[PDB]
């Protein structure tokens, strides 16, 4: 990745799944980068700012993407408690 000289000798940094901290590979075509809108707290309309979650294809296949996105949205204060 980075040599002793200090240069970043690497083609790219792959992105990692937000649910499992797994590397999303270059040929993972069931992988997702999802954007969820953040809204105003006084009017409830689209700010233009959003939150981004990556889900690898194995988790989506296993059927746990829905629970993972819900749990991350609870963590980030998008989904209310209960």
């Amino acid at each position: 990745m980075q040599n002793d000289a200090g240069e970043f000798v690497d083609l790219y940094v792959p992105r990692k799944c937000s649910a499992s901290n797994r590397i999303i590979g270059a040929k993972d075509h069931a992988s997702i980068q999802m954007n969820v809108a953040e809204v105003d707290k006084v009017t409830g309309r689209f700010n233009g700012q959003f939150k981004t979650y990556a889900i690898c294809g194995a988790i989506r296949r296993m059927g746990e993407s829905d629970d993972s996105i819900l749990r991350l949205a609870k963590a980030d204060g998008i989904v209310s408690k209960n």
Binding site: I32, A37, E38, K41, R45, R60, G63, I69, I78, S80
Partner: protein
Amino acid sequence: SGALDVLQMKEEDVLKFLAAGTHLGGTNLDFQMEQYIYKRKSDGIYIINLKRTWEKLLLAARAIVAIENPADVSVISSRNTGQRAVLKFAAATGATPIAGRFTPGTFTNQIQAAFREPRLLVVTDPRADHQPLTEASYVNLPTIALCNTDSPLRYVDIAIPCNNKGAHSVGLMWWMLAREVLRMRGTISREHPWEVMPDLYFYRDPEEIEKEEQAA
């Protein structure tokens, strides 16, 4: 809903849910849908918790808002019960509809008439619309689905828990999703009720259409 008093659940929406019957699940339950269920009654039908329905509906609305080109959201229904509703959703929001049979290879076969790239996919029934879910696994598409108690959650990213079997319920769910996405975009005030009455979204059923053309 970020525990915000603006986006909380109102009373008249709950009357819509109870009259349409969205709280009435099926008699079977998928184990990945057990989080969304209040309880099983002794009849056997699973009662769906409507606060969970509201929260997942608002997640779907937030995901649909975050796409700059509204035609990138694609909305699909294969069976008649949702078809009219999805068309109205398009006319409300600008999403691209597929009503009727989904030709396989719409998202994978590049040399084709109906080939198209979405950026989000919204599905009436994951059991009935399984083919676009498979396509979406091929082509990196997220998915929002209207999921009942007995629904597989393979390749479903936001699963709205609702009764998707009755015509009034699917019409209402599509109507509420359009209402919230169009409020949250900002073209409707949250204080005034929507001019579009939800009964526009339901299924025509041509015998009922003739029975209504009779009495006019």
